[PDB]
Amino acid sequence: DRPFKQRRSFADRCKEVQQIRDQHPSKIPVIIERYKGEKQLPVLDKTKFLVPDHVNMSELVKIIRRRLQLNPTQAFFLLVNQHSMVSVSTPIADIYEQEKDEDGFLYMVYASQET
Template sequence: MSRSNSASSAGYMPSFKDRKSFPDRIRMVQEIQRQQPDKIPIIIERYNTERNLPILDHCKYLVPAHITVADVMQIIRRRLALHPDQAFYLLIDEKSMASITMTVGQVYEMEKDKDGFLYIVYASQPAFG
């Protein structure tokens, strides 16, 4: 994956929340929900202290509510071009790990942010902190 962004090649990328204002994020979600009401708006970013895994080429995803967290992990694994043996972990809203059998819709209803996005971070270590 080519990364032309100098911030990402340096290993640091400001978070989506840092790059977009709260009102802008709310407008984005409202537009997404108007155009694609059956999709869940997700922001997937690398954990802020993670250095072993690459940064995804983009962070905004729209996924069907019925897919599982395991399906999301497969999407991330494929986009990061990870070796099948390389482990990584997902943290929902920087506070909890969701069961891989839960649907994205279930996680969204429990953990969506005030702006309407579901925030997920990924890291190579299970201990976040």
């Protein structure tokens, strides 16, 4: 259950982004993890997503919500560096250039609170 950055070294994370640049150049490499203090939402099956660079962030919110199989009642937020991405109808390619990690991944966190 450890976070991605505790399972992979910085150099290995950089090499993985570089490999994705070669093999899936039109995809943004995204890490999506459950907030550490999250109580209500389940853990997602997978952590690493290759997102076509034209996808709007607001659509990624809907996709992850569907993957979690929640009621329309359960609150859900997907955050990039504590910015909620529910209303961001901007392609991920633009968010990437602005919010990417030094290792080249784009890190997101989901929670039942937007704090």
